Amino acid sequence: KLAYEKSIEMAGNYANQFDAQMEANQAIARTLACTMAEYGSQDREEAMSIIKRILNENPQLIGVYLGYEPDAFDGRDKNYINAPGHDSTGRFVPYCNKINGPVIIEPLVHYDSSDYYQLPKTTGKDTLTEPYFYEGIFMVSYDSPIFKNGEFAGIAGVDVPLEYVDDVASSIRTFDTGYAFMVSNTGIFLSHPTQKNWIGEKSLSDFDVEEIKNAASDIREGIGGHVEIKDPITGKTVIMFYEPVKTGDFSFVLVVPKEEMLA
Template sequence: MARDPLFLGGEKKNIAPYVCRRKGVLHYRDLGKGDYNYAAWDWYSKPKTLRRPVWSEPYFGKGGNTLMVTYSVPVFVGENNNKFWGVIACDVSLNWLNKLMTSIILGETGYAFLVSRKGVYITHPNRNFIMKETVFNVAKKSRQPALTKVSQNMVNGKSGFVRMKSVITEKPSWCIYAPIPSSGWSLSIILTEEELMQNIIRLGRMEAAAGAAGFVLLLLIALLISRSITQPIRALDKATRSLAKGNLDAPLPVMDGEDEVAHLADSFETMRKDLKDYLEKLRQATAEKERIESEIHIARSIQMSLLPKRVPQSREFDLCAMLEPARQVGGDLYDCFMIDDQNICLVIADAAGKGVPAALFMAVTRTYLKALSWEAHSPAETLFRLNNELAHGNDGCMFVTLFYAVIHLATGECRYASAGHNSPFIMQSDGRVTLVPRAKGAILGAVKGLPYEEGMFTMQSGEMLYLYTDGITEAMNSAGELYGEGRAIEELKACKEMTCLETLDTMRASVEQFVDGAAQSDDITQLAFRYMGRDDYASVAKRISVSLPKYDLQSVK
């Protein structure tokens, strides 16, 4: 770095600190001291005059063994950059470049060389040419007019592809030359015509090698210039590596100023704080998710434990029920039990809400219902008393819909009451499917003292009563369409000759085909009861379904 001796005005003062590396050790001296007049040298005067960076002509350094080149950049200051401050220069050894050029294999006799802006050989296979000969001298000695024109074009920064005779092998060859814009040098490759024509593929490889050499040269020069600029970035990189390993408490280097590196450091500090906040929130969210999953598992266990382990068996009816839980725990429930030797009770219910609260509320509902059913009340009276029990102290405002039916096996008489639940379907012996007439009744647990209507119909031999929750009719496909009662009726018509288990399987398969892969949002609960009668059960006795599907509670999540 050399400052203009007259920059400060007044007395002339030379200041030119110089640093070089020899054998891995940095050496320093001031070129401004002593007799060295740097202002008279081209590396100083040319960039000052031209007001742009300048590459010097190659030269041998002190001792004559090292080929060097200098890159000089003028520095102007002031409001309009009109005041010359000095020159920043970098000396680059070219010994590596000559080794690189001679190491490039261009067939058996091909070679490459570099010439300066004045046509002086910088690299050449014949070391006697380096810094001693010019392309003009060689062209004159070889008496080749084409080579003289090539020499002029190379000095003028042109590129071309010309046929000539090699000065080394004296064989017909092709000369490829092109300028290096950043330095003003010219790169030339000599290939014998024989090798060129024999192997076109090899030519492509040689061109790629020459291009790679030029790229490496430019890359190295750029790295040398930018080295001093990247020091703060390296410090920042070291700190960010600690962040990358998860150490979010690692301090980042403080960068003063308003330049891009300082802004980058501030951005990394903001990122570090944001990452800490995000990970803390993620930890809390993960803990909450685990808590919810644990709650779902408990609720599912409660829900499944409420289901009867066995259903009543008799020659007078065919009975089957199944509950397929959704991912989110609902409050579905079914139950079936003999009140006495003549009467069987069928129950299906759906509690509001999800999770443990709904499961616990359904458990309370089932306990009360079992107790009240044994007291021989009518279905309407049973629901009336059940509602009063559930509404008492119901601070959580939970409620449940429920269908309750008692069937007299000797006569087929079915007495029922409904607490806001879906009306079941009756599959008649002639194949018709109808809804059970609705019996008015409010949801259970909302308000005490509400009355419930009681309905009654008589089942004929072979007729089936199909109870379900809204997981069937409100199943939704990806288009937002509901399965609905219409589809359920049409599907049940096809189940006329099926057993109860086959009917439930058919309905489940129909719903699954309709949703076509859409997520199941609610439990699907079904109960089918086919009345045989006292004297008409023999024809279907072998098809009676009395077992319940088994579910692995560990798989319910």
């Protein structure tokens, strides 16, 4: 059936549309990490200038940062203890951001425990966190390991607000009243056209509906597909088509009332 196939192709089309800017943001952190891996100039002020320029030239970013292991940037952490942009370790951990409006540089917090630093350190791979809120801002973080001498020295990262995802996805309309939304890898809503309190707060895995649990399981694995869900209350049936977003195995979901696709 052609209506189903068109729906599958449309869900994939949108998934790749969303993936494109994600691949760009991933490349910005990765290119910064490769560059820092070679930076023997070991100049903290200049490196702070570099991540500030990257933030200013990329309005889709809200933070750009570097985070280093002890003495791994310049062997001189002891000369920067509680300096501007630094915490009591002296580690080079500048977080150049506009989370609160103006551009400021302050030290990263929780780098010893949080996924944005710990996952690239443990996996040695470019990482995309699940979405989260930070000081009021819904976002994900792309982080790439800096390898110097063959060894993990730190990370380069960018933080990406996700309000735009709701702005774009919650405007899609298909057939008569079909709609769309995006989810993260663990099935957390990045958008919803009417339930704004679910954004960043509820997962597909939270629904007591066998089919939705199954879609969520496919999404976690980066698998595309569709499920049919009959509502015992309205009798009405919808098909949820979900297609993977290559970067992070997020997923784009189109929800189509079945009668409308048969109409």
